[PDB]
UniProtKB/Swiss-Prot annotation, chain A:
Involved in the binding of tRNA to the ribosomes. Part of the processive rRNA transcription and antitermination complex (rrnTAC). The complex forms an RNA-chaperone ring around the RNA exit tunnel of RNA polymerase (RNAP). It supports rapid transcription and antitermination of rRNA operons, cotranscriptional rRNA folding, and annealing of distal rRNA regions to allow correct ribosome biogenesis. In complex with NusB is involved in the regulation of ribosomal RNA (rRNA) biosynthesis by transcriptional antitermination. Belongs to the universal ribosomal protein uS10 family. GO terms for biological process: cytoplasmic translation; regulation of DNA-templated transcription elongation; ribosome biogenesis; transcription antitermination. The lineage of its organism: Bacteria, Pseudomonadati, Pseudomonadota, Gammaproteobacteria, Enterobacterales. This is Small ribosomal subunit protein uS10. InterPro entries: Ribosomal_uS10, Ribosomal_uS10_CS, Ribosomal_uS10_dom, Ribosomal_uS10_dom_sf. One of its GO terms (molecular function) is structural constituent of ribosome. PROSITE patterns: RIBOSOMAL_S10. GO terms for cellular component: cytoplasm; cytosol; cytosolic small ribosomal subunit; small ribosomal subunit; transcription elongation factor complex. It comes from Escherichia coli (strain K12). Keywords: Ribonucleoprotein, Ribosomal protein, Ribosome biogenesis, RNA-binding, Transcription, Transcription antitermination, Transcription regulation. Part of the 30S ribosomal subunit. Can also form a heterodimer with the transcription antitermination protein NusB. Binding of S10 to NusB is mutually exclusive with its incorporation into the ribosome. The rRNA transcription and antitermination complex (rrnTAC) consists of RNAP, NusA, NusB, NusE (this protein), NusG, SubB, ribosomal protein S4, DNA and precursor rRNA; S4 is more flexible than other subunits.
UniProtKB/Swiss-Prot annotation, chain B:
Pfam families: NusB. Keywords: Ribosome biogenesis, RNA-binding, Transcription, Transcription antitermination, Transcription regulation. GO terms for biological process: DNA-templated transcription termination; regulation of DNA-templated transcription elongation; ribosome biogenesis; transcription antitermination. Disruption phenotype: Inactivation of the gene causes cold-sensitive cell growth. Part of the processive rRNA transcription and antitermination complex (rrnTAC). The complex forms an RNA-chaperone ring around the RNA exit tunnel of RNA polymerase (RNAP). It supports rapid transcription and antitermination of rRNA operons, cotranscriptional rRNA folding, and annealing of distal rRNA regions to allow correct ribosome biogenesis. Involved in transcription antitermination. Required for transcription of ribosomal RNA (rRNA) genes. Binds specifically to the boxA antiterminator sequence of the ribosomal RNA (rrn) operons. Monomer in solution. Forms a heterodimer with the ribosomal protein S10. The rRNA transcription and antitermination complex (rrnTAC) consists of RNAP, NusA, NusB, NusE (rpsJ), NusG, SubB, ribosomal protein S4, DNA and precursor rRNA; S4 is more flexible than other subunits. It comes from the Bacteria. CDD domains: Terminator_NusB. This is Transcription antitermination protein NusB. HAMAP family: NusB. GO terms for molecular function: RNA binding. The lineage of its organism: Bacteria, Pseudomonadati, Pseudomonadota, Gammaproteobacteria, Enterobacterales.
Length: 87, 139
């Protein structure tokens, strides 16, 4: 069933990639999707590169059903790993 | 120079200015949110605040300084590199309380930490050309 109002819940996203161009494009796409959605963005921030892997963190606050649906529809490029949670 | 807290402030400023580049949120909200959610107990927070505000209020100027050195790139400048170079150029041009060599060296170290492969060599090359124009005394 539907996720309900998601009061006080946050979407937390961690991105990884070997290609910094791909990671920054995916980050931008996630930000745009969230903001067009009526949600707010925290970050994104870069972390220090580890084992030649670029890392970004971004969160989405006050997500709506339209936010979640827009994120699902978004096609993220091959070569970027996205870990995502809601709570 | 410089104190570890100021080094940490510049590190945090790269992260926050990356945030601002990507989110397009108001810089006042970026400052508030970053400081509310990030661990800054070891940071010169005043310097961090002054860096965001300064880079944000001089971005056209800073990007103008940077533009000629980007003329050969086939790809858009990376977001981390853009943040690092904005900060470095800002410090060279407005924060003469930061020694010339510190501003340059710390930019190279930030590119090494956060940037693309060989990012730090690119940053070194840009600053080697731009820095003596901004601070002709090299101090």
């Amino acid at each position: 069933g539907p996720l309900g109002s998601m009061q006080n819940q946050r979407i937390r996203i961690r991105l990884k990639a070997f290609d910094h161009r791909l990671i920054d494009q995916a980050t931008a796409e996630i930000v745009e999707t969230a903001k067009r959605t009526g949600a707010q963005v925290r970050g994104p921030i870069p972390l220090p590169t580890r084992s030649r892997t670029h890392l970004r963190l971004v969160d989405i606050v006050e997500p709506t059903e339209k936010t979640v649906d827009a994120l699902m529809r978004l096609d993220l490029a091959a070569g970027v790993d996205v870990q995502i949670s809601l709570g | 120079m410089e104190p570890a807290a100021r080094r940490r402030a510049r590190e945090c400023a790269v992260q926050a200015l990356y945030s601002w580049q990507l989110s397009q949120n108001d810089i006042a909200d970026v400052e508030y949110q970053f400081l509310a959610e990030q661990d800054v107990k070891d940071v010169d927070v005043l310097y961090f605040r002054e860096l965001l505000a300064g880079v944000a209020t001089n971005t056209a100027y800073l990007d103008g300084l940077m533009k000629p050195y980007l003329s050969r790139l086939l790809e858009e400048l990376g977001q981390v590199e853009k943040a690092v170079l904005r900060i470095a150029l800002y410090e060279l041009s407005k924060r003469s309380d930061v020694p010339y060599k510190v501003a340059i060296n710390e930019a190279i170290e930030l590119a090494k930490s956060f940037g693309a492969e060989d990012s730090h060599k690119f940053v070194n090359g840009v600053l080697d050309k731009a820095a003596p124009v901004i601070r002709p005394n090299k101090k």
